[PDB]
Design an enzyme around this catalytic site. Structure first.
Site, short mmCIF file in Angstrom:
data_model
loop_
_atom_site.label_atom_id
_atom_site.label_comp_id
_atom_site.label_asym_id
_atom_site.label_seq_id
_atom_site.Cartn_x
_atom_site.Cartn_y
_atom_site.Cartn_z
N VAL C 9 80.05 3.91 58.78
CA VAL C 9 81.12 3.24 58.06
C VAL C 9 81.68 2.10 58.92
O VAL C 9 81.44 2.07 60.13
CB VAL C 9 82.22 4.24 57.63
CG1 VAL C 9 83.26 4.43 58.74
CG2 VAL C 9 82.87 3.81 56.33
N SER C 10 82.41 1.17 58.31
CA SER C 10 82.97 0.04 59.05
C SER C 10 84.35 -0.46 58.60
O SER C 10 85.05 -1.13 59.36
CB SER C 10 81.95 -1.11 59.13
OG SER C 10 81.18 -1.23 57.94
N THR C 11 84.74 -0.14 57.37
CA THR C 11 86.02 -0.61 56.81
C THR C 11 87.11 0.44 56.97
O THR C 11 86.85 1.55 57.45
CB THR C 11 85.89 -0.96 55.30
OG1 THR C 11 84.52 -1.21 54.97
CG2 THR C 11 86.73 -2.19 54.95
N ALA C 38 81.87 2.56 63.13
CA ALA C 38 81.92 1.22 63.76
C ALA C 38 83.34 0.69 64.07
O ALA C 38 83.93 -0.04 63.27
CB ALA C 38 81.10 0.20 62.95
#
Lengths: 179, 178, 179, 178
Positions: C9-11, C38
């Site tokens: 995931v990143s958000t 991330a």
DNA sequence: CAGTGTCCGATAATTTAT
DNA sequence: TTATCGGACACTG
DNA sequence: AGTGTCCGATAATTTAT
DNA sequence: TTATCGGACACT
DNA sequence: CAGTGTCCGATAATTTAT
DNA sequence: TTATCGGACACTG
DNA sequence: AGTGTCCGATAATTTAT
DNA sequence: TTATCGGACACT
């Protein structure tokens, strides 16, 4: 399932024997193998109408179905509509999935982009050959010196076409060149 | 000569928006065409009024042809005539080899998505119609009244004049509650 | 065969729960499911070294392995070298064939071309927002009027950082703005 | 500033040809670089001597990188620095989005072919080594003579001086006919 | 010898887009 | 992106 | 020293569209 | 691919 | 009335590229 | 591409 | 005429990222 | 998708 087979040729090299050779070794017999010798793609249209729901075809490679990416699809589209799948034995892709046909149509446009460039380089190389000083097309076969002497005579044009056993129409056009 | 083309599908008529960009490119509504898919007549007309040396525009790619197949068909017919479409969003011109190719690939892939998601929609319809959801437009006309106007022994035609509603419906209504 | 699982995931939307959810329903257990959040892609490197000949992995969709097409390949290449295959559950493509990875790497570059354009339109839309007259970044939180009065005083700069319990370094830079 | 790059693999050094086109584009041998793959040193050097505002050239696409993977790696490193490769044969520039993409796709496909045909070569090696073909370089040195120079009871070192040939080979030769 | 000013890099808080 | 937060030197005195 | 093994670099090879 | 070249080692 | 000249389109023979 | 081959009209005489 | 069936065009619906 | 509208037919 009830497998079909389709191949084609277009050059003086009738590499057709090879095309068929494996279409059999795949599983399909001549009893159901179709052929256009591109001299008009008739044997295709006929295959198009012999197939029914849940059939399966086989074409050697990607070029062999259609030359022009545009309708290479039309076939597939019309084909998937009926429920028939064509495989690209050399390429190993199935009309039958999505990803398959998707990646069929993928490969075609990427392969025509090769031909489309080729032809431009082919023609660019003919325009630097025509201008360079090379003889084009077909050569004179019948002595125009023999015809021009037979017209300065004031001889009837129709008579000449059987003294020299040639076409009557050419007789005229021949005299029209030297202005 | 330069030209603009746009289209729509949704009840959300993003049509006013597509045209805007076209004017922000240099084409007037004097040379802009539109089809409100409800039947692609307006396209045919544009395809019939351009000669060699002309250039067409569409905002998005999918906008010209939804289906990858006839999309190339147009472009082919188009390059042959001497015309070429630029797509402003993606910035690709059919005026080339790669261009044309790169229109096509883009659009093929584009569809594998469009087509798979479609299937997912239908799966969602399937997991809804089985769970117990009422589809279509909901009923309006007070049927228990129409049914009470036959039970009366009244003319079916008579009904359709008394209530400002259709006659053929009246009959269908009765053969509903067996 | 001995299946693995990988997601990321990143958000601020940690849509990770969803990622995993199907990696199980595919066949692989958490016992072998890896994760980078991330915030540095560590849990990947570790997966990279836990795998051996004839293993198989699973990643939700195409973006979820790698963001940058360039090394999305490197992984696959290095991966196929070992004999490990990663599947794109949403996309349905196999690292394992040729055509598979070929069409993996196909789809990535065609999908980044979307992001790469997006970011240009995102930035073009920030350059027409900055110039329009919009406030940027982070807002002033500590009264600079309170600091400037405490410096015109001729007061020692170090003293102020505990009268107003703030950073000492900011005190200075604050006075430097109004020339 | 503009630059030229070329490469070769075959004993058929089509190298003179690649360079020609480069000059027919505008880059001098003053800004041209070459690697004769036998080890891509000359590339590194070019990759170390270009700044922002420069443009590189290669005839064919495959010529830059054979393997699709590190091909993008370069191009990536390249767009970041500010440089971009035009390919004359295919006419695509990394100086763009699509360009870069269209370098990549091209090259992926390009390989599926390269890679499948490779396999076909190996199948042909397989259907040859089994039928009874002698691979490698054929033997030269008159062994029946060397073998006759041990059977003699002569020093192995002595042999290698008498015949202008290598010593380590001499020994290997004897442990050939058990 | 210790306080005053210059200058970072690493962290937290914000914006524009989906 | 821009604000603070810890700090690091380097001179000043 | 000089006789025997056991590597890797260079040459010459073949196969493929 | 296999045959030679250069070698570098370990033992009488 | 019939022979002379204009003008096609469909076929065979050729070229440049792979 | 360019050469002949069959032809089709259309005027001329 | 007027009572009953059986179509296709138009409206209003839902599902999906 | 299902509900209504317009109809157009075939029979008393």
């Amino acid at each position: 399932m009830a497998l079909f087979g389709y191949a084609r040729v277009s050059t003086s090299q009738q590499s057709l024997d090879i095309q068929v050779r494996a279409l059999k070794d795949a599983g399909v017999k001549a009893n159901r193998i179709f052929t256009d010798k591109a001299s008009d793609r008739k044997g295709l249209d006929l295959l198009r109408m012999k197939v029914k729901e849940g059939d399966v075809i086989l074409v050697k490679k990607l070029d062999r179905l259609g030359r022009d990416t545009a309708d290479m699809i039309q076939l597939i589209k019309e084909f998937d509509a009926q429920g028939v799948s064509i495989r690209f034995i050399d390429d190993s892709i199935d009309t039958s999935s999505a990803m398959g046909r998707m990646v069929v149509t993928i490969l075609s446009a990427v392969a025509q982009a090769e031909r489309q460039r080729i032809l431009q380089r082919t023609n660019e190389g003919r325009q630097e050959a025509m201008a360079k000083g090379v003889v084009f097309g077909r050569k004179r076969k019948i002595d125009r010196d023999a015809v021009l002497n037979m017209w300065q005579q004031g001889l009837g044009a129709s008579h000449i076409s059987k003294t020299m056993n040639i076409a009557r129409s050419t007789v005229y056009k021949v005299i029209n060149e030297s202005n």
